[PDB]
Structure formats: C-alpha cells, structure tokens
C-alpha cells in the first residue's frame, strides 16, 4: 500500500522545483520536509506519495462546526496516513492526532527590518508608531489570543483592533510587509522561518531578542495509527545520527545568501 503523506507549501520545508510541471510524483517537490519524508519512509520501510493538503491549511477546529480542517482534518478523517510539515505541536491538535517527538525546535520571535528601534516584545507593546502582527491564523496568533501575561494581553488587544489589519495570510506577505514598511512593521513568527528569512537575499531582516515560548514541529499520524511507533522511532534515529541537524544546515545555512 502506498502511504499518503500530506504536506503543505512553505519555504524551505516544501517547495515546487522550477521544472515541476515537467516532472511527476514526489520528484516535483524539494525542501527540508521532502528530505525528511523520504528518510522517514526509508526507515519505516514504506512506499509513499506526497500530496498537498486540499484546503491549503495546517489544522484548526471550527468554533461552531467543530470539524477539523487542513492537514489535521485529513489525518482525523481518513484522507492521509501521515503529515510531514512545519506543524506546530499543540495540545488541541494532539487531542485528535498523534505527534512524533519534535524533529525541530522553535519559538515565537520578532522579525524586523534592520535599523528598527525595537529589541523586545515590551518595546513593541509600549509604542504605536511601529505596527506589528502575526499570521492570520495558526498557533502564533492563538498564543497571543490566550495569553494572560501582561505584555502579551496588551499586544493581543492592540493586534485585534489595529487596521490596516496587522494580520497577513502567508509568511511571504508578512515578510514583504516588513521590507516595504521602512521599519514601521515588525512581524511575529516562528523562530525557524525568521532564521530562514534572515539568510535570504536582501539581507535586510533580522530576528531581535529571544523567543516568546518553546515549541516543536512534529510528524503527525491519525490517533492509533499502526505507523505511529515506527515513525517516532525513525525521527529519534535521525536525530541521534545527526541527520536532522544536517538537513537544517543544508536548507537554512549552506543555501543561505547573507
């Protein structure tokens, strides 16, 4: 049986090769998560087909409908066998799918254009001339919506009502907005994407300060999957043999431009 592995387009995790229309199946993708999926499949000893999540979403549960969407929905409801992506391990998700141990560690962080006079979340919260916001959905925005920490409530209260809306739909847009705002827009995103962008050629962005929390990305399987054990053990093996670190360096630093 060919395992259906669901993923999502996000640099440098999963990307279309330049000639992808002249290629087929797995070959048309490249990235960190493409290499991981391959490694995982090797050690789990399985055939797999990569497939892009139909609705292009990570996974959230509808307030009223209460149905899960995205990659999480595809795992829960029988569309896919495993998800390999920058899917943040969170309580709400783990309640309905299983996550392997983290294959990558991360935290919420601040991206600014070099020269911007802010150096921490407090600096942002005590001012207004510099706008800031998160992705329009995902674990980062949820982190802010739920926080009861003084500076983060305040940042949430501000973000909610700010318009022009501070929320953007993609990482590409948050970044493009940082670069084009002449130091008037920050951008809160996962430290991993921050570090990636840092090495991208205009070299005019930078992470500032420390992370706001400590998370990880995990490989996901439907709860009770006969694959869950093998997948988790493969991730650990790949970690201990240092291959996860080599893939991070390859996609983040060897290919960096700054």
Ligand X SMILES: C=C(C)[C@H]1CN[C@H](C(=O)O)[C@H]1CC(=O)O
> Can you give the binding site for ligand X, defined by CB under 6 A?
10, 58, 86-88, 134-135, 138-140, 171, 189-190
User: What is the spatial distance between Cα 25 and Cα 66, in angstroms, rounded to a whole number?
Assistant: 33
Q: By CB under 8 A, how many residues form the interface with a copy of itself?
A: 21
| Three-state secondary-structure class, residue 87 | coil
CB-nearer residue toward a copy of itself: 54 or 107: 107
CB-nearer residue toward ligand X: 24 or 143: 143
Phi-psi region of 98 (alpha: psi -120 to 50; beta: other; left: phi over 0): beta
Site string for a copy of itself, 147-176 (x = CB under 8 A): --x---------------------------
Kindly state whether residue 91 participates in binding a copy of itself, applying the rule CB under 8 A: yes
For tokens 């847009």, the residue is 173
For tokens 């996962």, the residue is 190
Q: Which of 21, 24, 64, 95 binds a copy of itself (CB under 8 A)?
A: 95
Is 86 known as a binding-site position?
yes
Structure tokens at 247: 């893939």
For tokens 């990482």, the residue is 171
CB-nearer residue toward ligand X: 83 or 206: 83
CB-nearer residue toward Zn ion: 115 or 164: 164
User: What is the spatial distance between Cα 8 and Cα 36, in angstroms, rounded to a whole number?
Assistant: 14
Burial of 251 (0-12, 13-18, 19+ CB in 10 A): buried
Q: Which does 105 bind (CB under 5 to 8 A by kind): a copy of itself, ligand X, Zn ion, none?
A: a copy of itself
Q: How far is the CB of 237 from a copy of itself (least distance, A)?
A: 5
Cα-based distances in Å from 131 to 84, 142, 158, 180: 33, 19, 9, 13
Is 95 known as a binding-site position?
no
Q: How far is the CB of 130 from ligand X (least distance, A)?
A: 19
Q: Of the candidates 179, 166, 155, 110, which has an alpha carbon nearest to the alpha carbon of residue 133?
A: 166
Site string for Zn ion, 154-173 (x = CB under 5 A): ---------x-x--------
Burial of 11 (0-12, 13-18, 19+ CB in 10 A): middle
Is 93 known as a binding-site position?
yes
For tokens 């960190």, the residue is 32
Site string for a copy of itself, 235-254 (x = CB under 8 A): -xx-xx-x------------
Is 205 known as a binding-site position?
no
Cβ atoms 244, 104 nearer than 8 A: yes
Q: Which residues are annotated as a binding site?
A: 86, 88, 93, 139-140, 190
**What residue ranges bind a copy of itself (CB under 8 A)?**
89-91, 94-95, 99, 101-102, 105, 146, 149, 214, 216, 218, 232-233, 236-237, 239-240, 242
């Amino acid at each position: 049986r060919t395992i259906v592995v669901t993923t999502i387009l996000e640099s440098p995790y999963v990307m279309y090769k330049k000639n992808h229309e002249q290629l087929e199946g797995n070959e048309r993708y490249e990235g960190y998560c493409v290499d991981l999926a391959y490694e995982i499949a090797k050690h789990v000893r399985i055939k797999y087909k990569l497939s892009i999540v139909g609705d292009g979403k990570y996974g959230a549960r509808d307030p009223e409908t209460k149905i899960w969407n995205g990659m999480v929905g595809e795992l829960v409801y029988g569309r896919a066998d495993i998800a390999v992506a920058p899917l943040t391990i969170t309580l709400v998700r783990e309640e309905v799918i299983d996550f392997s141990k983290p294959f990558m560690s991360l935290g919420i962080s601040i991206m600014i254009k070099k020269g911007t006079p802010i150096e921490s979340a407090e600096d942002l919260a005590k001012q207004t001339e510099i706008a800031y916001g998160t992705l329009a959905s995902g674990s980062t925005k949820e982190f802010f919506r739920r926080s009861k920490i003084a500076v983060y409530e305040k940042m949430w209260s501000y973000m909610k009502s700010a318009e022009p809306s501070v929320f953007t739909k993609t990482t590409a847009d948050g970044v493009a907005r940082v670069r084009k705002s002449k130091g008037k827009f920050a951008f809160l995103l996962e430290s991993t994407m921050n570090e990636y962008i840092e090495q991208r050629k205009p070299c005019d962005t930078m992470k500032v300060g420390g992370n706001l929390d400590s998370k990880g990305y995990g490989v996901a399987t439907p709860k009770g999957s006969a694959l869950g054990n093998a997948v988790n053990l493969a991730v650990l093996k790949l970690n201990e043999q240092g291959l996860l670190d080599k893939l991070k360096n390859k996609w983040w630093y060897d290919k960096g431009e700054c």
